Design a binder for this molecule. Structure first.
Ligand code: NA
Lengths: 12, 99
């Protein structure tokens, strides 16, 4: 398991 | 493995600009969204009103490269912008939705 990648506003 | 993911990302970025430099201007008709590097993925010239998609990248350990990223080119030929900060935004949410 790993930290979750952000995919919200301010990301690509 | 994050060192490798970043390297993959920077290679794709360089490759994207090479691709955008070499392909001829858009040959289609009517309004369209311009080719662009969105920060993680390269997108080609896209007709107005089209929801473009491609595979998720593998830069991050929780990303599934068999899922799809979507990017919406609206009917005025403008890439979708996130309403929170009004900047162009591709939809990577399915890349790690089911991890
Ligand atoms: Na170049």
């Amino acid at each position: 398991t790993y930290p979750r990648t952000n995919t919200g506003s301010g990301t690509p | 493995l994050y060192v490798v993911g970043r390297k993959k990302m920077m290679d794709a970025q360089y490759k994207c600009y090479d691709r955008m430099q070499q392909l001829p201007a858009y040959q289609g008709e009517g309004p369209y969204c311009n080719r662009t590097w969105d920060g993680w993925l390269c997108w080609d010239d896209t007709p107005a009103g089209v929801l473009s998609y491609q595979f998720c990248p593998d830069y991050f350990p929780d990303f599934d490269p068999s899922e799809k990223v979507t990017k919406y080119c609206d009917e005025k030929g403008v890439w979708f912008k996130h309403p929170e900060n009004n900047r162009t935004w591709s939809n990577y949410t399915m890349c790690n939705a089911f991890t």
